Structures are given as structure tokens and as C-alpha cells.
RNA sequence: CGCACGGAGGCGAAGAACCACAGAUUUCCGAAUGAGAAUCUCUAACAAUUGCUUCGCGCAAUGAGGAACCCCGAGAACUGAAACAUCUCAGUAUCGGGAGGAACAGAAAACGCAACGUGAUGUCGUUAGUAACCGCGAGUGAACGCGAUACAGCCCAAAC
RNA sequence: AGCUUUACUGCAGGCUGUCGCUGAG
């Protein structure tokens, strides 16, 4: 497929959102990324 | 057009309008179709003018037959704005009536006679 | 109003381009053209830009590979920041 | 004495006789070649227009609209229907043709508001009405003691909400007594049984 | 912190611009040091630099430049 | 120094945080309006429809949204009638158009406890499941009046 | 429920008369 510049920005964001909850947030909140998406098991929009 | 039953020669129309101008400066004249209509009905009309480019024609259709059953003579003017200018208006006039001329009664009288002849 | 240059893109690959090809790499606003990247860079660091290559990254930003003239030295320009 | 206007009025009591008859037979030929909504500089029926609120002033507009004659242009049912609801031919719309005309006019002039309208005849297949519209934003009207009322916000799109004269009659609001049990204050408040 | 509002209102229209360009540069050089993972940072300034720029711009708007 | 109790660091007596009011900034798509486009792009823009008009987009209007309410149009069927067609469900569901903070109505070509009487209009209570409708089946179903609430009455067309 | 027909009742559509558009001798 051929991605447009906008589609690319969106894919980019989805990839970023796919990171984990930083180590410190765990301590700070004294104790999950409910949006962990796998490329294979999941499906993005568009 | 539906109310026009005879054509008035340019020259005749020229005389008529000129007579109207000396009528506003000397005697008295009525401007507007409503004021003109009341002249004919009140009898204070000597000569009534009717433009031929009136649209809708309803505004003037009645003048002719009304005048006939009132002895009042009438003449047609080709353009609406010329009659209004002669009457002394900045706007046009679908109809005007010379309510008692003045130092024009001689000419007016002729115009009337020139029309009756023109049928 | 948005600025053209965001920040220096400093990665191993960026360094090689700096040492071996006299090129500087930047994260720049994705609305900026090669020409705008060229100017902004000359004005911010006072150097002569010979060529600019751009790329719309999978990070949502635009990367610009800017080659300087032989008159300037990338390593030096980069070293002062 | 009789006003000149009374003569226009009297002519239109019988649009099929006298000079008026000949006029219409002539005009309609041109009208049939005009569009759906034609703005005209002067009302064809001056007495009627003035009588309805018209004024030779800035912000006052007049447009003639033609609408097809006859019943509803209805499509036959495409699913199950009891006999009572299978009709097509004899069904007529609940809005009269004059009201349809007022609406088509108002759509053409989105910024204007319908003040009133009247009939100017018909031929075998269509009817013509002239609609009077007012520019609620023109200061010549905002300062008019007889028309500035139409500038209020609640008078917006009045034609589409049946606030027009033809609207109120067509809604059965003419009578104040017997017969208007389900029309006043509105058809909707009365369960739509008017 | 270091740059107060009075000080900004006392500057001339041309001094705020010069000051603006100065601040923008400290900011750019900080983000550069940050990009290089450089830790000689002091997190408060990069955050303060942004507000200072916002203040100067606000005043430039207020003063008509 | 948000939710959020980390680390580093910073801000605050130049009175910060925080709250109220007012103002500044306010990317792109979006009624979306220069043109095109799955939020981008291409070469000055009220696109489109209108009013006024210095007839020049010069001055203006419309567009879309909103929980439901409100007004104007289009308008079923299951169902009930122990079947079913009129009837009923119901002018309901749903659809089209449109306004406001509320809408709509409204100063009698009224009422008609018929009177030597009432006196704009909504609405509430009642009149009453009365009158009226109806395979006179099933079902459907007001009004005048009265007691209340709140009260307010005017402007044109024409004559001259 | 789908289907059929000289089942019951209706609805489109076609044919035809009439009125309007529609006038002169
Ligand atoms: Cl309207
Ligand atoms: Cl009573
Ligand atoms: K049924
Ligand atoms: Mg990664
Ligand atoms: Mg490329
Ligand atoms: Mg109501
Ligand atoms: Mg666009
Ligand atoms: Mg049943
Ligand atoms: Mg039975
Ligand atoms: Mg019912
Ligand atoms: Mg009653
Ligand atoms: Mg069956
Ligand atoms: Na996938
Ligand atoms: Na970056
Ligand atoms: Na309109
Ligand atoms: Na009814
Ligand atoms: Na804002
Ligand atoms: Na606009
Ligand atoms: Na213009
Ligand atoms: Na049953
Ligand atoms: Na059955
Ligand atoms: Na029945
Ligand atoms: Na009583
Ligand atoms: Na079946
Ligand atoms: Sr799969
Ligand atoms: Sr004129
Ligand atoms: Sr990355
Ligand atoms: Sr509207
Ligand atoms: Sr009262």
C-alpha cells in the first residue's frame, strides 16, 4: 500500500501510544496500558 | 398598449409636454395616477396625460374609459420619465393631469382638438 | 508562528554523516521545505548550506540531512551545542 | 372619491373579462418561459400588495412563483398497506399551492422573510402567485414603524412555521369560535387532528 | 523567575525582540543538549524559558509591540 | 509544580499555588466558504443563494450545533375488533423543513347557561366519558359555561 | 410467509366521455 503524509502521522501516533507506562508512574501512584496493540493480533483504523 | 387605441405623433407629444411644463409654472397640475384619477372623478381635470410604458398596465388601464365618461380629454406620452420630468418631478409619472392650465389654455385647447380629430 | 528548526538529530548515523560527509541532521517542522530548512540553518549557525535532504519520519516529525560547504566544518558547528 | 387602486382591484374580481383578460392571455406567454421564482420590480396587483403591507421602499421585494396545479405527486406504496392506505390518485397535500409558492420564494432569498402573498392567475397546468418579501437587516426597514416588527428574531423563517397569512388560514385558525377546537393554538398541540 | 514582568514592560519594543531572540536561542540550545542526552540540564530553565517567551509575546501584544 | 504518594530540579515575601471576573494566545479538519483532498495539498478568494448598492464582495444576510421541549409538512405496521376489509393501534413510530429560551395563540364577520347576558389568547381544575361518531360492533370522544392562573391592548390598507 | 386464480375487497396502469387550459368564423 501507499501511505499519505496524514496516514503516516496517524500510524506514527499509534506506534507511540504503544509504549508502556513509565517506571516512575508506578511508584508515584503506588501501583497497565489498556491500549497495548499488537500489529498482528490487533487491527488499526483506515 | 391594451389601453392605447391611437398613436400620437412625436411632434404632438412634444407640444403637449411643453404645455404641461408651462402648466406647473403657471396654473396647476396633478402628478401621480391616484391624484390624476381623482381629478377626472371630481371634474377638475382639463387635460390628462398617460404614459405608454407603464408596467403593470393595470395601474392606468382605467384612465381612458374613465375620461370618456367624463368629457375629460387625454393624450398618450411614449415615456414615463418624460411625463414625470415635465410635471416637474425627479422621478417618473405614469399619469398626470393639468388641473386648470394657465397661459397654456390656448395650446391645451388645441391639443385636445388635435386629439379628438386623431380619434 | 512555528519555527523551522526543532532540534539536532543526534544518533550514531547522524555522527557518521557529520564526521565523514560534513552533514548536520535536524528534526524540523514538517511544514518546512528544503529551501526553508536551508535558510533557517544558515541564519542560526552562520554557515553555507550546499544541499538538503528531507524525510517524513515514523515519529511524526520531519528529519533533514543538511550538507555544509567545504568552507564550514560540521563537527565544529555541532560541537558548540 | 374612488382611489385609483380601487380600479385595479375591481379589474381582478373578474380576471377573465375586459382588458385584464387580454393582458393575462399575453403575459402568461412570457411567464411560462420564465423560471420558478422571478423577482419583479413592481407588483402586478398594486392594490392587493399595498393592502397586504407592501411599500415602495428599500428592502421590500416582490417575486412571482409558479407551481404546478393538481393533487399530490405521490408514489404508490412499496410494502404492505391496508386498502384504506393504498391510494395514490386522490390524495391531496395538506398545504395549499399558495403556501408552497411562499416557501419556494423564501428559499430563493435566504436572507429575506415572507410578508404575504397573493394570486395572479393560472393556466391549465400551473398557478402563479406574487410573494412580498422583506429584508429584516436593511435600516430602511428596521426604522419603519409599520414593518420593523418583522425584524425580530422570532420572526425568522416565519413562512416555514406557518406564521404567514396563508399559513394561518390553511391551519384552520380563521375562526375564533366553533370549528377551531383542534386548530388553536396549534395543530400539533391538538394531536394533529385539525 | 529571573525575568519579571516589570522588567519586560520597561524594555523598549526593540529590546523585547532582541530579548525574545536571546531566549529562543537559549531554548534551542537546551533542547539540543537534551537531544544529545546531555544531562548538564537544570529542568527548571527549559520550563522557565517557555514562560518567559510567552510573557514577552503577551507584553508585545499588550503594548502594541 | 493536575489526576499521580517517583527521581532530579524548579517556582514562591518582586506575595506563588488556588478562586472570581476580564483580556491575550488559540495548529489542522470541521457549516467549512479560493480550488481540490480519508484531517493534506495547489494557485488570492464571503464558495453558493440573496438584500442594499458608491454596481467594487463596498456594506450586510443565510448555512451548522443544541437534552428534550415547540411550530410547519410526509406518515406505517405489528396490535385490538378474540378471523377481517371500515374502524382500531394513531395522526402514534419514523422521515422532511424551521424558530426560541421558551414556542404557538391572541384583541371577535366570537359566544348563543337566548340573555336587560359574557367580552382577546394560552394553560390548570371541572363541565364528562356528557353531546357527537361507530360492521350503531369493538371502540372513539369534544365544546359553551364555571372555578382558577395571568392579564393589555394596539398597527396598517383606503377615504381626505 | 411465498405462489395462483373466473375467491373477497381494493390499488396502480391502459382505453374512453366530460370540464379547465380554450380562441375567431
Ligand atoms: Cl420566511
Ligand atoms: Cl356566557
Ligand atoms: K390494520
Ligand atoms: Mg518502537
Ligand atoms: Mg523524499
Ligand atoms: Mg401550546
Ligand atoms: Mg476548503
Ligand atoms: Mg384481530
Ligand atoms: Mg365482531
Ligand atoms: Mg381518534
Ligand atoms: Mg360551543
Ligand atoms: Mg398466509
Ligand atoms: Na493487523
Ligand atoms: Na523530536
Ligand atoms: Na428566506
Ligand atoms: Na379535521
Ligand atoms: Na482558548
Ligand atoms: Na457571509
Ligand atoms: Na459586490
Ligand atoms: Na384476535
Ligand atoms: Na389472522
Ligand atoms: Na366504523
Ligand atoms: Na352559571
Ligand atoms: Na414462504
Ligand atoms: Sr490475522
Ligand atoms: Sr421610476
Ligand atoms: Sr522512533
Ligand atoms: Sr434559518
Ligand atoms: Sr383581560
Curated annotation (Swiss-Prot), chain A:
SUPFAM superfamilies noted in UniProt: Ribosomal protein L39e
Domain of life the protein comes from: Archaea
GO BP annotations listed: translation
Matches recorded under InterPro entries: Ribosomal_eL39, Ribosomal_eL39_CS, Ribosomal_eL39_dom_sf
Gene3D superfamilies: Ribosomal protein L39e (1.10.1620.10)
Keyword set includes Nucleotidyltransferase: no
GO MF, any single term: structural constituent of ribosome
Annotated disulfide bonds: none
Keywords: Ribonucleoprotein, Ribosomal protein, RNA-binding, rRNA-binding
Family: Belongs to the eukaryotic ribosomal protein eL39 family.
Function per UniProt: Binds to the 23S rRNA. Forms part of the polypeptide exit tunnel.
Alphabetical list of NCBIfam families matching this protein: PRK01242.1
Subunit structure of this chain's protein: Part of the 50S ribosomal subunit. Interacts weakly with protein L23.
Name assigned to this protein: Large ribosomal subunit protein eL39
Protein source organism: Haloarcula marismortui (strain ATCC 43049 / DSM 3752 / JCM 8966 / VKM B-1809)
Swiss-Prot record, chain B:
Compartments, record wording: Cytoplasm
Keyword DNA repair: no
Coiled coil spans: none
Keyword entries, A-Z: Cytoplasm, Ribonucleoprotein, Ribosomal protein, RNA-binding, rRNA-binding, tRNA processing
GO CC annotation terms, alphabetical: cytoplasm; ribonucleoprotein complex; ribosome
NCBIfam families named among the record's database cross-references: eL8_ribo
Protein name: Large ribosomal subunit protein eL8
Curated annotation (Swiss-Prot), chain C:
PROSITE patterns: RIBOSOMAL_L23
Domain of life from the UniProt record: Archaea
Gene Ontology molecular function terms on file: rRNA binding; structural constituent of ribosome
Pfam families per record: Ribosomal_L23
One GO BP: translation
InterPro entries linked to this entry: Nucleotide-bd_a/b_plait_sf, Ribosomal_uL23, Ribosomal_uL23-like, Ribosomal_uL23/eL15/eS24_sf, Ribosomal_uL23_CS
Key words of the record: Ribonucleoprotein, Ribosomal protein, RNA-binding, rRNA-binding
Gene3D superfamilies reported in the protein's UniProt record: 3.30.70.330
GO cellular component, one term: ribonucleoprotein complex
Family: Belongs to the universal ribosomal protein uL23 family.
Function comment: Binds to a specific region on the 23S rRNA. Located at the polypeptide exit tunnel on the outside of the subunit.
Subunit architecture: Part of the 50S ribosomal subunit. Interacts with protein L29 and weakly with protein L39e.
Name of the protein this chain belongs to: Large ribosomal subunit protein uL23
Organism whose genome encodes this protein: Haloarcula marismortui (strain ATCC 43049 / DSM 3752 / JCM 8966 / VKM B-1809)
Gene name tied to this protein: rpl23
From Swiss-Prot, chain E:
Family annotation (SUPFAM superfamilies): Ribosomal protein L29 (L29p)
Gene Ontology MF terms in the entry: rRNA binding; structural constituent of ribosome
Listed GO biological process terms: translation
Keyword annotations: Ribonucleoprotein, Ribosomal protein, RNA-binding, rRNA-binding
Domain of life: Archaea
InterPro entries: Ribosomal_protein_uL29 (IPR050063), Ribosomal_uL29 (IPR001854), Ribosomal_uL29_CS (IPR018254), Ribosomal_uL29_sf (IPR036049)
Any one GO cellular component localisation term in the record: cytosolic large ribosomal subunit
HAMAP family in the cross-refs: Ribosomal_uL29
Self-association state and partner proteins as the record states: Part of the 50S ribosomal subunit. Interacts with protein L23.
NCBIfam families hit by this protein: L29
Physiological role: Stabilizes the tertiary rRNA structure within the 23S rRNA domain (domain I) to which it binds. Located at the polypeptide exit tunnel on the outside of the subunit.
Record family assignment: Belongs to the universal ribosomal protein uL29 family.
Protein name: Large ribosomal subunit protein uL29
Organism whose genome encodes this protein: Haloarcula marismortui (strain ATCC 43049 / DSM 3752 / JCM 8966 / VKM B-1809) (Halobacterium marismortui)
Organism classification: Archaea, Methanobacteriati, Methanobacteriota, Stenosarchaea group, Halobacteria
